[PDB]
Structure formats: C-alpha cells, structure tokens
Amino acid sequence: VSQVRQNYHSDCEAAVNRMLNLELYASYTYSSMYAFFDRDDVALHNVAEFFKEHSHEEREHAEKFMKYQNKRGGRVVLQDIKKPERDEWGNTLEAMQAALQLEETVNQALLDLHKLATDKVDPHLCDFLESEYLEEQVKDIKRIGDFITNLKRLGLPENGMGEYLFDKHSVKES
Amino acid sequence: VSQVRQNYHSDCEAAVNRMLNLELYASYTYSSMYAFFDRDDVALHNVAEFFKEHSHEEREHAEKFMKYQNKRGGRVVLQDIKKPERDEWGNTLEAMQAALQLEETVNQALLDLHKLATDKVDPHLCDFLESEYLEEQVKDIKRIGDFITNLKRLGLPENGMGEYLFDKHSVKES
Amino acid sequence: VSQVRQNYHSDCEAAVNRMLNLELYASYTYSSMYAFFDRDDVALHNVAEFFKEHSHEEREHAEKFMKYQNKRGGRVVLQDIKKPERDEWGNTLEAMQAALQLEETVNQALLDLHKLATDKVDPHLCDFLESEYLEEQVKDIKRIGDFITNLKRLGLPENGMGEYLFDKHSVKES
Amino acid sequence: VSQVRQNYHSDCEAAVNRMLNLELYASYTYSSMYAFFDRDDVALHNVAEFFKEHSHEEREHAEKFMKYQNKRGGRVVLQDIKKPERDEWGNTLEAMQAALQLEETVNQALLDLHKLATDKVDPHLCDFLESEYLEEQVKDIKRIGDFITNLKRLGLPENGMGEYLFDKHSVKES
Numbered sequence: 001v002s003q004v005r006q007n008y009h010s011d012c013e014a015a016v017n018r019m020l021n022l023e024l025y026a027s028y029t030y031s032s033m034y035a036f037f038d039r040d041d042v043a044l045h046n047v048a049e050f051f052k053e054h055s056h057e058e059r060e061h062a063e064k065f066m067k068y069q070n071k072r073g074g075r076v077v078l079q080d081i082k083k084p085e086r087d088e089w090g091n092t093l094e095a096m097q098a099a100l101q102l103e104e105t106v107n108q109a110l111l112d113l114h115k116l117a118t119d120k121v122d123p124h125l126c127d128f129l130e131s132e133y134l135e136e137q138v139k140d141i142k143r144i145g146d147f148i149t150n151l152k153r154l155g156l157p158e159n160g161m162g163e164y165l166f167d168k169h170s171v172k173e174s
Numbered sequence: 175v176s177q178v179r180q181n182y183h184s185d186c187e188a189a190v191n192r193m194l195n196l197e198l199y200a201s202y203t204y205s206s207m208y209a210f211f212d213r214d215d216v217a218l219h220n221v222a223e224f225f226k227e228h229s230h231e232e233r234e235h236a237e238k239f240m241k242y243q244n245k246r247g248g249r250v251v252l253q254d255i256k257k258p259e260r261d262e263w264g265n266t267l268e269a270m271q272a273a274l275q276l277e278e279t280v281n282q283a284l285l286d287l288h289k290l291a292t293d294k295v296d297p298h299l300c301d302f303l304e305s306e307y308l309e310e311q312v313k314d315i316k317r318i319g320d321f322i323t324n325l326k327r328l329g330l331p332e333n334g335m336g337e338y339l340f341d342k343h344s345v346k347e348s
Numbered sequence: 349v350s351q352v353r354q355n356y357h358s359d360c361e362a363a364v365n366r367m368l369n370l371e372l373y374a375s376y377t378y379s380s381m382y383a384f385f386d387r388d389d390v391a392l393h394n395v396a397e398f399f400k401e402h403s404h405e406e407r408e409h410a411e412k413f414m415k416y417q418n419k420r421g422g423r424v425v426l427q428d429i430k431k432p433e434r435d436e437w438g439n440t441l442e443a444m445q446a447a448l449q450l451e452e453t454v455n456q457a458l459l460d461l462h463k464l465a466t467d468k469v470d471p472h473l474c475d476f477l478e479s480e481y482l483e484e485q486v487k488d489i490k491r492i493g494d495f496i497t498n499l500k501r502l503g504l505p506e507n508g509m510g511e512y513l514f515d516k517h518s519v520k521e522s
Numbered sequence: 523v524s525q526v527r528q529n530y531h532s533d534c535e536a537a538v539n540r541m542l543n544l545e546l547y548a549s550y551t552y553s554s555m556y557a558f559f560d561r562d563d564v565a566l567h568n569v570a571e572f573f574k575e576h577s578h579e580e581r582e583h584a585e586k587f588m589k590y591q592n593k594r595g596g597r598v599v600l601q602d603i604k605k606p607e608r609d610e611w612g613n614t615l616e617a618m619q620a621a622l623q624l625e626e627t628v629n630q631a632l633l634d635l636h637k638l639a640t641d642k643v644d645p646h647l648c649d650f651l652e653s654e655y656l657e658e659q660v661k662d663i664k665r666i667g668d669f670i671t672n673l674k675r676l677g678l679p680e681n682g683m684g685e686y687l688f689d690k691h692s693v694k695e696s
C-alpha cells in the first residue's frame with residue numbers, strides 16, 4: 001500500500017485508469033477528425049484546427065488523471081488506445097454530430113465516476129470531477145450543440161456554401 | 175407634501191410610475207428574447223447579446239424615472255412586472271418585429287406623458303422626456319426597422335443562411 | 349428533448365425557473381429600498397446606493413440561472429415579478445432587517461435546490477450552487493447581520509445621529 | 523430696433539432683466555450666509571464655503587442672462603440689488619431653510635418666464651430656460667431638501683454635535 005494512500009478505494013483507482021483511457025481514446029478520435037478536414041478534398045482548415053485543439057485538450061485531461069492517480073497513491077495502468085470508429089467523417093455536420101456523441105459518452109463516464117466516488121465516500125474525488133471536468137464538459141457539449149443547430153440552419157449536408165461559411169465564421173480563424 | 179415639490183401635478187407623478195413599470199416590462203421582454211436566442215436549438219449569440227444589452231438599457235431607463243420621481247418630490251410606487259407576451263420568439267425576424275412593436279408602445283407612452291406634462295404646464299418634465307428619451311427612442315426604432323428590412327432581404331423566415339449571416343454581420347460581434 | 353440534455357431532471361429544470369424568479373423578485377425589493385433612501389425626506393444616499401448595488405447583483409444572479417438553464421438544455425420559463433411587500437421601508441434598521449430576511453429566504457431556496465439536485469443525483473447542479481451561490485450568500489448574510497448589530501449599537505431607530513453616522517461610515521461612500 | 527432682433531417680445535426682454543436682478547439678489551443672499559458662517563462665533567467653515575460657491579453660481583447665472591439679452595437684441599437694464607432679508611442666519615438649519623425658499627422663489631420666476639415665453643411663442647427662450655436653468659434648479663432644490671432632512675435627523679437646532687458633524691460630512695471639505 002502506498003504511504004500516501006488514504007480514503008482511496010480500489011474501485012475508484014481502477015475507474016480512474018479507465019477514464020484516463022477514455023480521454024486518450026477521445027483525443028485520438030479528434031485527431032482523426034483534424035486529419036480528415038485537412039485533406040485536399042475536404043479542405044476546411046478552421047474546422048480541422050478546432051478538432052486538433054480538442055484533441056490536445058483531451059490529452060491534457062488524460063494527463064491530469066495520471067497526476068491525480070499518483071497524488072492519491074493509486075497506480076497508473078495503461079491499456080491500448082483504440083482507433084476511432086470511422087476512418088472518414090463525411091462532412092462538418094456528421095463530424096460535429098459524432099463529437100457531440102463522444103462528449104456525451106465522456107460526460108456519462110465522468111458522471112458514473114462521480115456516482116462511484118459518492119458511493120465510496122470520497123469527497124476529494126468528487127471535488128476533482130466537479131472542479132476540473134463536469135462544468136467544462138457541459139460547456140463543450142453546449143458549444144457543439146450550438147454548432148449543430150447552425151450547420152442545420154446553413155443547409156448541411158447539401159449546402160456547400162453553408163459549410164464554407166461555417167468554417168469562416170463559427171470556428172476561430174486559424 | 176414634499177418640501178421640494180413645485181409645479182408637479184399628481185397626474186404626472188402617477189404617469190411617471192406607470193412609465194417606470196413599462197420600462198421594466200420592456201426590459202423583461204428583451205431578457206426573454208436574450209434567453210431564447212441563447213438556446214442550443216436557436217444559437218444566434220450575437221442576436222441574443224443585442225437583446226441582452228437592450229434589456230439592460232430599458233432597466234437603466236426605469237432607474238432614471240425613479241431618480242426623476244424623487245427629484246421632483248413624487249413618490250415611487252411599484253407594481254408587478256408582467257411576464258412577456260410570449261415564451262418563445264420564433265426567429266430573428268419575429269423577434270425584431272416584436273421589438274419594433276414594443277419600442278412603438280414605449281414611444282407612445284412617452285409621447286402621451288409629454289402631452290400630459292404639456293397640459294399641466296410642466297416644462298421640466300417636458301425637457302426631461304425630450305432630452306433623455308424621445309430622440310434615443312426614435313434612433314432605436316430606426317435601427318430595428320433597418321434590421322427588419324435586412325432580414326426580409328435575407329429571405330427570413332425561410333432562409334436560414336440569411337439568418338446566420340445577419341447574426342454575423344448586422345449586430346455587433348459579442 | 350434538447351440534444352445537449354444529459355442527467356437533467358424536469359424537477360430541477362422547474363426549480364431553476366423558480367429560483368430565477370426569486371432572484372428577480374429580490375432585485376426588485378432592493379430597487380425599492382434604493383428609491384426609498386433616495387427620497388428627499390429620507391436622504392441617506394450611501395445606504396441607497398448599497399441597495400442599488402444589491403439590486404444589480406441579484407439581477408446578475410438571475411441572468412446566471414438563465415444561462416445555466418440553457419447550458420443544460422432546459423427551457424427558461426418566466427413568470428410575473430411580484431412587487432415588493434412594502435412601499436416604504438421605515439429607516440435603515442427596518443430595511444436591513446428586511447434585507448436579512450430576504451437573503452435568508454433566498455438562501456433557503458438555494459439550499460432546497462441543492463437538496464433536490466442531490467436527490468436527483470445531479471453533481472453539476474450541486475457544483476453550480478456551491479461555487480456560484482452558497483458562499484456569496486453566507487457572506488451577504490454575515491455583512492447584513494453585522495450592519496444590524498451596528499445599527500442597534502448606534503441607537504436605531506430613535507437615534508438619528510446614529511443613523512447619519514452609519515451612512516457615512518459603515519457603507520461605502522458613493 | 524436692433525438689427526439682430528427677431529421673435530423677441532418686449533415683455534420677454536423686460537422679464538429677462540427682472541430675472542437678471544433676481545439672480546444677483548440671490549447671489550447676495552448667499553454671500554451673506556457665507557459671511558455669517560465664517561464668523562468666529564459661528565465657525566462652520568464648510569457650510570460657509572458651500573454658500574460662497576452658491577453665491578458665485580448665482581452671479582454666473584446673472585451674467586448668462588446678460589449675454590442672452592444681448593444675443594437676442596434686447597437691452598440690459600440694471601436695478602439696485604436689494605440687501606438680503608436677514609443680517610444673521612441663526613444656524614445651519616435656518617440658513618438651509620432660507621436657501622430652500624430662495625431656490626423655490628428663483629424656480630418660480632424661471633417657470634413664470636417659461637410661461638411668458640410660451641405665450642409669446644418664443645422657442646429659443648424656452649430652450650434656454652430648459653437647457654441652462656430648470657434642471658440645475660431642480661437638482662439644487664433636491665440637494666438642499668436632502669440637507670434639511672439630515673439636519674433635522676442630526677437634532678438641529680439644539681444638537682450642536684449634530685451641527686458640527688453635518689459640516690464635516692455633508693458638505694465638501696474646503
């Protein structure tokens with residue numbers, strides 16, 4: 001047993017490792033989206049850079065779980081990072097719809113971990129999730145939902161001019 | 175009778191309280207518009223912020239009537255602030271049309287108060303309305319009429335791309 | 349159902365709308381206090397400005413609930429904003445006593461919402477209340493209790509010189 | 523007839539000369555108050571300086587009527603400036619009560635001149651009064667009423683400590 005370990009349940013330790021893996025998985029999916037939108041036959045570079053930044057964010061969130069695990073005296077255990085579900089992402093609407101689902105999946109895992117931390121009476125883990133994850137998750141989901149509404153408004157998937165304009169005006173110029 | 179009161183008719187005092195209530199009512203309607211355009215299924219954030227700023231303006235104009243009332247030795251009497259007529263506002267065109275009607279209503283109440291102040295030979299109240307309200311009212315009505323013309327030009331309500339572009343180009347970026 | 353909605357109970361959504369209304373109600377009561385202390389026959393302008401600032405704070409806290417509601421995919425539903433319980437507020441002691449009761453009422457509604465969020469296993473709503481409301485509420489209650497103790501010390505309600513001095517020294521010069 | 527004169531009734535010209543005299547009269551009364559509060563056996567120097575500043579303000583307002591008269595092609599006609607009604611002013615309360623009455627008298631003369639300008643269809647004279655006089659008059663009356671309320675609160679005329687404190691805290695330090 002680690003000399004620092006206190007009030008840290010084995011189940012929470014294991015769930016933190018799973019959460020670490022899921023954040024790496026999410027980062028990898030966003031990287032795939034980046035590379036798709038960077039293609040010469042897709043060529044929406046502001047959308048591409050949005051996904052690249054989100055890939056970096058998810059990787060940072062993985063690293064935070066690693067640091068957390070060690071702070072509590074748990075032990076980081078890594079597994080394979082599964083490739084993304086798709087090799088190509090259709091268009092900006094399809095990608096953002098997939099991003100929404102991914103954020104919802106990550107959010108459910110965070111909420112499930114909070115339930116487990118609550119069940120095991122671990123307020124430090126509860127605080128960690130609430131302070132570092134749950135609100136930024138809600139913000140990201142809201143942003144992507146807002147995007148989807150605008151892409152539909154712009155006539156995606158059929159309206160290429162709409163898709164062009166989204167890339168110029170809804171995501172930051174890169 | 176207040177020690178400061180001079181040339182201030184009871185009818186004007188009461189009409190100032192009604193005007194205070196109407197400005198609060200107007201502020202509340204603009205707040206509702208703000209919240210509508212902030213929805214994830216509406217998501218026109220520059221339009222939303224336009225209405226939020228107008229809500230704050232109308233609240234400031236209410237406060238100015240309160241300060242006025244006391245300066246003249248009248249007594250502020252508050253009533254309920256009625257909820258807005260609608261819970262949802264359709265789209266940017268419908269909202270701006272409602273905003274135009276609201277500004278016209280507020281303008282008519284201001285013009286009616288000026289008539290009353292004139293009838294009661296109250297030049298200080300006349301000056302107040304002319305200097306602090308009537309011209310800014312005309313400017314706001316003109317701005318919103320200009321907006322409506324452009325929203326029609328852009329093909330509202332059917333043309334979502336038009337609605338998107340209005341939000342990017344006609345209202346200030348927030 | 350909103351595309352962003354996750355782990356958000358209908359009961360919580362409705363309680364958030366009620367909380368929004370209560371903050372608007374509170375703002376309106378403080379506005380009334382402002383106008384009372386601004387009267388020529390009351391004329392305690394630092395006290396007046398204290399209440400004006402608190403009215404603006406409560407309105408900002410209402411706006412935060414609106415933004416919250418939309419972030420979670422709930423729907424803002426507005427009701428009338430009831431006028432304050434009194435048209436005149438006696439003196440600084442009576443007003444501060446009413447302010448204390450109002451803050452206690454708002455605090456109880458916040459604590460009740462936290463209980464509901466807890467019952468519905470909504471940690472994001474719990475965090476929101478804890479991070480944005482509950483501590484600032486405790487601070488405001490403490491400040492007003494401290495004020496009441498000093499107003500009693502100063503001999504309110506009978507001691508006008510005491511009331512004058514409170515306005516010069518206990519609330520910020522405006 | 524002056525080469526510049528247009529739409530300027532003889533009655534208005536004469537009333538402007540009377541108004542000029544009244545402003546000089548008012549200035550002189552405030553000067554008397556200044557000298558009273560400067561006495562070694564009165565010695566309220568912030569109150570004294572308040573009245574001195576008001577004497578200078580009223581003299582500037584006289585000068586503005588002179589300039590007005592010439593701008594319209596009327597002719598400045600001066601009369602004696604009557605000494606103030608009192609040689610000594612009692613205490614701060616009595617003085618402020620007299621100041622209130624004086625401001626009310628000046629305000630009534632301004633309102634009477636506005637009525638005359640209205641009757642003679644002189645919008646330039648109306649504008650002049652509204653823009654340069656009527657609102658600053660209302661502000662001064664409000665300020666002095668507020669002062670009187672506070673002097674009563676402080677226990678004037680009997681409470682010397684109250685009178686001392688007013689001089690330190692309600693009027694600007696000179």
Ligand SMILES: [Cl-]
Nearest residue numbers: 005006007008
């Ligand atoms: Cl342990």
Ligand SMILES: [Cl-]
Nearest residue numbers: 006007008121
């Ligand atoms: Cl423990």
Ligand SMILES: [Cl-]
Nearest residue numbers: 008009010011
């Ligand atoms: Cl364990």
Ligand SMILES: [Cl-]
Nearest residue numbers: 017018021079
């Ligand atoms: Cl895993």
Ligand SMILES: [Cl-]
Nearest residue numbers: 079080081082
């Ligand atoms: Cl596998």
Ligand SMILES: [Cl-]
Nearest residue numbers: 085086087088
């Ligand atoms: Cl694929």
Ligand SMILES: [Cl-]
Nearest residue numbers: 090091092163
């Ligand atoms: Cl495409």
Ligand SMILES: [Cl-]
Nearest residue numbers: 132133135136
């Ligand atoms: Cl967070």
Ligand SMILES: [Cl-]
Nearest residue numbers: 146147150217
């Ligand atoms: Cl958006």
Ligand SMILES: [Cl-]
Nearest residue numbers: 154155156159
């Ligand atoms: Cl289309």
Ligand SMILES: [Cl-]
Nearest residue numbers: 147150169170
């Ligand atoms: Cl957008």
Ligand SMILES: [Cl-]
Nearest residue numbers: 179180181182
């Ligand atoms: Cl009157």
Ligand SMILES: [Cl-]
Nearest residue numbers: 181630633634
């Ligand atoms: Cl009159």
Ligand SMILES: [Cl-]
Nearest residue numbers: 182183184185
């Ligand atoms: Cl009347």
Ligand SMILES: [Cl-]
Nearest residue numbers: 191192195253
């Ligand atoms: Cl009303």
Ligand SMILES: [Cl-]
Nearest residue numbers: 253254256428
């Ligand atoms: Cl009703």
